[PDB]
């Protein structure tokens, strides 16, 4: 039972599945069908998101952690 | 809580000195009346009066 | 206890300390005081130095309070002040031009005019003479009159009511009735004045 | 002297030059775009002034710069406007909904998610929405006000799936959804069947360019927070046991395109939450952290003096601060002291003073 796991390991994690479905839905939205989740992992955005969820789930929630989270998701979602 | 916890508690029961299979609190009454003394034998009860 | 002799009363007026250099009697008084600069009483937790505060509202607060819920008395006083302010402004929205210019929107001076309406002026005392108790008219001191008016508003808000209507709307409607010379506390004041008129030949029984 | 009310009702015309502006909204417009959900202590302000005058809060405008250029190719995109309690978290969602009806989007307005959780007394089960308990009364609250949010685009929907209504009735094909939402509002036994079938039908037609769907749900901490409503043998349930809200949780999973969903975390009835928790992960919980569908957290801040000076100077033309010495400069600095430039604690003083 993963309740006894202490750290947020990105392996088969749920927000990983959310941003992964996000990469599939976004690459369908752009109609550019390069669908390789292992290539989609190679972007700076999803790994800044990964470091932000790891830092946010282990280190308890501060303002600057949400600044880093906002910066990652803001350059991620093609929002200005 | 699941059997990960049940097995950790069972092995710490075999380790630290508690009973490994689960039981009732009514049956833990016998282990708390056995982990101490009866009332009559204390040096300040039967030797209340010298 | 646990205060002592010579301990002085609180001071709140900041501008009094700003410019006291104009007189000579109180000038020599605060020369005599600061020359001593005695052990004063500490400032209580109910009063402040602010300009947004009022003594009569804090007294009607404390005379409204049951026991140790200063928070609930604070909620009731805040709710009734805002509710009566918005009733006067909702009457402002249904006003004409001169009705705009004659309806007052400050709840504070309306409340103090309401208390001056609420104020009894001639009082009672039970005096025994010839074996009977006789109700004599006596003129009252000022703090007695104002205390009576405030507790009158409090108790006729409290118990002479229906169990339906909630208290800040209740006290707002009470202040509204007391503001226009037609509330029931005025009718009780008129009965008190009427019976002090009725026992007018007893006014020689007072020895003071 | 603060620049307040020359800027008219135009959420499509808010610049950064337009700062601190009490923009007046016509009251008929609030009959169209906000009868569904609003904070309860805000209704005192409007019916006393007849001025729905929202000052320019800089994060309240800043989300609109993410709604001009959010493309309709991209899916359902979450947005949260969180912060300290009383900074107008529930009022900063009010700034964006008036834009989307001005840009003719599809307003899936939800008033308050806390009332979906707490304080509903009469309880039914379900058979058509897969055997879970559900509230027909809370469905009855929602189904009436939703139509008058947007009435132009609800009847243009064609329901392209034959749904079964009863053992006496069904649903007719290609009908306007203005029928289908309100066809069984009379037969309240399965008016909780009128939500999960219907909102998942608005998922399909959102993908095309005729409809722009956006979830507008207030206080999402209750959607993944464990509820207080109990069963018959004194057993509490999950928030995943309510078939009224179980299909509602299907929507914030980016499964449709064409619109940009907005949500506002609130602190009125945050059950099993301390009062000093005000952040998203601190309120939504663990179930509100995994199923985040990556959201953009908007930290609603406190006032600057530019929002502070706009406030009381607005109240001076309205002759609202009735006290004698209150417009003195130091009498501003005590309201600046006691209310700490927070909007909701200033209105409490400007309620009675
Ligand atoms: O332009 C405005 N922006 C915001 N946020 N609030 C606001 C504006 N004009 C007036 N107000 C006042 O804000 C109060 C409501 O705050 P609320 O209810 O959203 O607080 P919470 O805790 O949920 O964030 C109210 O007085 C309204 O008149």
Curated annotation (Swiss-Prot), chain A:
Subcellular location as annotated: Mitochondrion
Coiled-coil residues: 14-78
Family that this chain belongs to: Belongs to the mitochondrion-specific ribosomal protein mS35 family.
Subunit architecture: Component of the mitochondrial small ribosomal subunit (mt-SSU). Mature mammalian 55S mitochondrial ribosomes consist of a small (28S) and a large (39S) subunit. The 28S small subunit contains a 12S ribosomal RNA (12S mt-rRNA) and 30 different proteins. The 39S large subunit contains a 16S rRNA (16S mt-rRNA), a copy of mitochondrial valine transfer RNA (mt-tRNA(Val)), which plays an integral structural role, and 52 different proteins.
Name assigned to this protein: Small ribosomal subunit protein mS35
Primary gene name: MRPS35
Positions spanned in the full protein: 244 to 323 of 323
Curated annotation (Swiss-Prot), chain B:
Sections of the chain in a coiled coil: none
Compartments (UniProt record): Mitochondrion
Source organism superkingdom: Eukaryota
Signal peptide positions (record): none
UniProt similarity note: Belongs to the mitochondrion-specific ribosomal protein mS33 family.
Subunit structure: Component of the mitochondrial small ribosomal subunit (mt-SSU). Mature mammalian 55S mitochondrial ribosomes consist of a small (28S) and a large (39S) subunit. The 28S small subunit contains a 12S ribosomal RNA (12S mt-rRNA) and 30 different proteins. The 39S large subunit contains a 16S rRNA (16S mt-rRNA), a copy of mitochondrial valine transfer RNA (mt-tRNA(Val)), which plays an integral structural role, and 52 different proteins.
Protein name stated in the entry: Small ribosomal subunit protein mS33
Species this chain originates from: Homo sapiens (Human)
Residues of the full protein shown: 4 to 53 of 106
UniProtKB/Swiss-Prot annotation, chain C:
Disease named in the record: Combined oxidative phosphorylation deficiency 34: An autosomal recessive disorder caused by mitochondrial dysfunction and combined respiratory chain deficiencies of complexes I, III and IV. Clinical manifestations are variable and include congenital sensorineural deafness, lactic acidemia, and progressive hepatic and renal failure.
Glycosyltransferase listed as a keyword: no
Superkingdom as given in the UniProt entry: Eukaryota
UniProt subunit comment: Component of the mitochondrial small ribosomal subunit (mt-SSU), essential for mitochondrial protein synthesis. Mature mammalian 55S mitochondrial ribosomes consist of a small (28S) and a large (39S) subunit. The 28S small subunit contains a 12S ribosomal RNA (12S mt-rRNA) and 30 different proteins. The 39S large subunit contains a 16S rRNA (16S mt-rRNA), a copy of mitochondrial valine transfer RNA (mt-tRNA(Val)), which plays an integral structural role, and 52 different proteins.
Gene Ontology MF term list: mRNA binding; RNA binding; rRNA binding; structural constituent of ribosome
Keywords of this entry: Acetylation, Disease variant, Mitochondrion, Primary mitochondrial disease, Ribonucleoprotein, Ribosomal protein, Transit peptide
Source organism of this protein record: Homo sapiens
GO biological process: mitochondrial translation; ribosomal small subunit assembly; translation
Subcellular localization(s) per the UniProt record: Mitochondrion
Modification N6-acetyllysine occurs at: 174, 194
Pfam family, one: Ribosomal_S7
Gene: MRPS7
Annotated family: Belongs to the universal ribosomal protein uS7 family.
Identification of the protein by name: Small ribosomal subunit protein uS7m
From Swiss-Prot, chain D:
Keyword field contains Ribonucleoprotein: yes
UniProt keywords, alphabetically: Acetylation, Apoptosis, Deafness, Disease variant, GTP-binding, Hydrolase, Mitochondrion, Nucleotide-binding, Ribonucleoprotein, Ribosomal protein, Transit peptide
InterPro entries in the record: P-loop_NTPase, Ribosomal_mS29, Ribosomal_mS29_met
EC assignment: 3.6.5.-
Start and end residues of each stretch annotated as Disordered: 1-22
Tissue and organ expression note: Ubiquitous.
EC class of the enzyme, as a word: hydrolase
Residues carrying N6-acetyllysine: 130, 162
Keyword Phosphoprotein among record annotations: no
Domain of life assignment: Eukaryota
Catalysis performed (reactions): GTP + H2O = GDP + phosphate + H(+)
One annotated GO molecular function: structural constituent of ribosome
Location relative to the cell: Mitochondrion
Annotated effect of mutating residue 347 to K: In PRLTS7; uncertain significance; slightly decreased thermal stability; slightly decreased GTPase activity
PANTHER family noted in UniProt: MITOCHONDRIAL 28S RIBOSOMAL PROTEIN S29 (PTHR12810), SMALL RIBOSOMAL SUBUNIT PROTEIN MS29 (PTHR12810:SF0)
Quaternary organization: Component of the mitochondrial small ribosomal subunit (mt-SSU). Mature mammalian 55S mitochondrial ribosomes consist of a small (28S) and a large (39S) subunit. The 28S small subunit contains a 12S ribosomal RNA (12S mt-rRNA) and 30 different proteins. The 39S large subunit contains a 16S rRNA (16S mt-rRNA), a copy of mitochondrial valine transfer RNA (mt-tRNA(Val)), which plays an integral structural role, and 52 different proteins. Interacts with DELE1. Interacts with NOA1.
The protein, known as: Small ribosomal subunit protein mS29
Taxonomic path: Eukaryota, Metazoa, Chordata, Craniata, Vertebrata
Name of the coding gene: DAP3
